[PDB]
Design a protein around this ligand. Sequence first.
Ligand code: HEM
Ligand code: TPF
Length: 528
Amino acid sequence: VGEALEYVNIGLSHFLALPLAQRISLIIIIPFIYNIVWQLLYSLRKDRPPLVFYWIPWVGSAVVYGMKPYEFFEECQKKYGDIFSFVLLGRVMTVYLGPKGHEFVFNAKLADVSAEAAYAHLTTPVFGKGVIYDCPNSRLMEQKKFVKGALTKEAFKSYVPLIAEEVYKYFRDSKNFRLNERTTGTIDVMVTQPEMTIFTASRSLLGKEMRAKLDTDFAYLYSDLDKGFTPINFVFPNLPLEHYRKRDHAQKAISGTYMSLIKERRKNNDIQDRDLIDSLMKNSTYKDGVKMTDQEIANLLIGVLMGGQHTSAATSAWILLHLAERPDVQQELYEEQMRVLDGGKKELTYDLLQEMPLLNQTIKETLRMHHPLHSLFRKVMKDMHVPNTSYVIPAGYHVLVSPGYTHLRDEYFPNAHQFNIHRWNNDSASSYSVGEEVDYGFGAISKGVSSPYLPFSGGRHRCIGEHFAYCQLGVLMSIFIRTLKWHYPEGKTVPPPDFTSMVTLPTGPAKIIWEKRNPEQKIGGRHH
Ligand code: HEM
Ligand SMILES: OC(Cn1cncn1)(Cn1cncn1)c1ccc(F)cc1F
């Protein structure tokens, strides 16, 4: 009776007096035991998707998910089906695989899920305050509208010869090529492509001043800011270490440079239609009348250039890598170049790029097999009912959607693990809406988000850099094809993806051997 409760207190007393050898042992085994008991109890709930069993509390399935996410998804899909949850470094992730998952997450109501609540911890320290995910959604919608204003057909027409010039400059001057001095050589594509991507993106979107600054020690700052863009920042966004200080310094230094150019252009009234800087200076006033600050404009520049940097560089690296073991595809692409550009006598233009279906299909196919973002997250803000199930996703959970996984399923893409650009025959468009449209604030886009092919997502958070990426990748690959042949070192093949980084770039070093199609061909212009 009450004598029982006396022994409760006595037991508590004897608990606190255990040797700290047993106490430490107990504060390990008790959370461990409770974790297992909780999961087994959790599995009784029929309004919750199945939860992947895990031994270590808090950690969850982080190790297997972090290293081989698609293999994790497939095993989980076999056991539980398309909807299942797993614990990830303190968080509960609810995965919804397949097209229905795309609809459930990408077309979720604004009040139901939050992208910025999921990503702000990562991106804000890198890009700066006030923009992208450090603001309400309505602000992001208009920022996208602003950026999209410099991403027009007319802009792409002017970008193409600029991007082309940068590619030829890189072939001429970079130590990785030097085509005027060498006719063959070995490159690491994870060295060349990030460089070619930043040179071409900077020249076209930022302008000649900012491009020129990449020829200096300023370039190291981009590398510093680069290191801040890492999954580690999802768990440890701010540790007092040098990595984080160089990042924060780089952000200030780079945004300061952008603001300097911005204020100079405005003081000289030198505001044209050259680049994204000009565009944002003329067009960055929200609908409620508030103007973006020069800091916010610079930070938006950083975010847009940085994101486009990683997605595009990774993509062109995969293209080169897949093509390295496919001389048949290089050959077919080369013939297309000769036919469309009249044996090379025509100058490449944006309009001529659109008449290169096989080149564009090659980009399209590479993006199928190598979605640079294997997982997209939203934080659940309100309890969500999953249609045609009894499942309820409580607020505090995160939903995870993965079109890249569906890209690699035989059911939706026959022989999915085979690189075949001809699966897109007479369907070379980067993507398109097969029906009704909707405008979230940055232009009419597809209402339905059910396509098995969805490398640019859909819904309010859909990519707006798709046409720029195709323009950039197109020009670049057009010139690679016309200038070089390339192949693997003996016994080398397409490397496995590095799923552990921010984008799922190839595992390096990923080397290819190039050779000039025309050994005698010289690239003009001056250099020291
Ligand atoms: C192959 C190239 C690219 C791919 C595959 C890609 C993919 C994506 C995806 C999947 C999203 C949606 C993320 C989500 O749903 O959470 C997205 C959003 C976005 N991307 Fe891209 N991207 C690429 C290139 C670019 C480029 C070149 C730019 C800029 C020039 C850019 C700027 C943006 C912006 C501003 C968003 C909006 C983010 C949001 O609304 O939350 N992307 N991209
Ligand atoms: O969506 C990203 C952020 N992200 C999400 N998972 C991993 N990285 C990447 N990205 C997508 N297209 C281009 N970059 C992004 C979105 C917008 C942006 F401005 C920067 C940025 F990193």
